[PDB]
Amino acid sequence: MLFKYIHDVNAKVEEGRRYLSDVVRVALDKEETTDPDTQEVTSTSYRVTAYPVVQVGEEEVPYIPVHPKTAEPGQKVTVPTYDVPEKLPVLVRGRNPEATGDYDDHIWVTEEVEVRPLVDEVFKEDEFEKARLYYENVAAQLAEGDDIRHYYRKDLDREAGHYSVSRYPSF
Amino acid sequence: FTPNLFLNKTTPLNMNASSQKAPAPGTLAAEIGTANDAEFGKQTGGGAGVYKYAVTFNNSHGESVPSNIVDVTIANEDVAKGVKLTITNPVSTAFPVEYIKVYRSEKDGQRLYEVAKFAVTTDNSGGVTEHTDKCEILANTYTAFMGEMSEEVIAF
Amino acid sequence: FTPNLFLNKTTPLNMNASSQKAPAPGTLAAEIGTANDAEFGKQTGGGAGVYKYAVTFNNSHGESVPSNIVDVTIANEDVAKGVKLTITNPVSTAFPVEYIKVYR
Amino acid sequence: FTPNLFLNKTTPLNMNASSQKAPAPGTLAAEIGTANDAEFGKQTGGGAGVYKYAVTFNNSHGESVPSNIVDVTIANEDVAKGVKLTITNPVSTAFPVEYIKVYRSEKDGQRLYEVAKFAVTTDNSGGVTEHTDKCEILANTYTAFMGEMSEEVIAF
């Protein structure tokens, strides 16, 4: 994990189906494929991902002050660690199969749903600058205060201006 | 006398979370304490009996799911000694935890009610909070308030 | 008679996803089924031959890339039995799957 | 003659970051280089002495905290040979690095001032940038501009 960004989303984002946690993690990582015999690598790729994460522990890190503050030579602060969960709850409207009257017919039920990544992109061994730009754009768009909305990549797209192929239904 | 319709008794335990942003459930361990000022013997029939204990984890967003239920047997000579509770934080909570609620049943009862409310010692995952119960509040009871209602005493 | 420019034939397969929010591709398997009312024999000169199968995974946002292409050989006596497909969902996708399209 | 208050001298070093999104600090190593045209001998008393070095990591958001401070001793025979700096990028940063600012002290001084500014060879984690210091700018010094000011020469 070359880069790591922990962002705090607001209540409106936290209520979305894809965002079922109060903290979103954005990271860039490098992957390799090696032959089974030895460490002979065959290819290298960069992956950019965003995940809803949960707290699983704490760790000791150095303290980094900001301009209106001053720090001791060896001051340290504690920060939480995060890990990808498996299922997160959500409340939906439902009905009581064993209701007895008009006051306990409508209820709210809790259902657990599968967690999926928000972003998952793969870049080749070259074009590390493109992966870095994508990571920075995702982080900035999260910092804008809304959901992640833009996913368009020019490399993975159909040719524009090809009328004999774009006339088919897509709606 | 001013009867108030929203002044209720101890809230009975709820088996479902109040909101989706509430923390995760944890674990509870209970045993006879070592204090010497417990008030279990103030009941009419005495403090001897069997009691049930359960806890829930809380934040500013809602109430979590009840933890495991533990049965504690109190003898007639242990009424002066409280109950020491060991509360463990959830391993992988998705929302932070801020305080705890303790639920106790009646003497030789089945249904639990809220009797205590205090903050956590630490919010780290897997943290341990130790509390000693002295039976300050009896389950399934009411509360009333009396005082001078004037601007010179109380205001908003 | 009203000719329409946007009324077309069966859509040919494309190798590029229509959008970046489409689900990830999966896997496909095909074999001779056990039906008894297939219409493979209504073509000129019978229906026995070799056919190619591929599927795509779709949602409200777009269409995925094609899956693996499998080859099915249909004999003369198997024209009345259909072709059974076994579509498998992607293991890890950012957006879920909603429906399937079959390309032949 | 037109005096300007914001035409400052070499900026002294600050010990704290200027933003939340600044890059993480890295490491720095310095030693005598192999150049043959360094300008450390242009000072009045010579170039012999002990100099202190430090670097900071920058991006579009802000500036990081200073890295470690090293001491380099220059003899009278090594004046023409510059100082070689090895700057190593952090391995666990949140936002990537864009350029480096070099801070140097005076001859046997104690405070550091900005004397250089250049981009990185690569912004990848663990990247290594090598720069040779030839004392182009002296610490704690000024700069003045003279020229023809007219709409036909300069404009905004």
Automatic annotation (TrEMBL), chain A:
Highest taxon above the source species: Viruses
Protein name: Gp29.2
From TrEMBL, chains B, D:
Keywords: Membrane, Transmembrane, Transmembrane helix
Domain of life of the source: Viruses
UniProt protein name: Gp6.1
Span covered, complete protein: 261 to 416 of 468
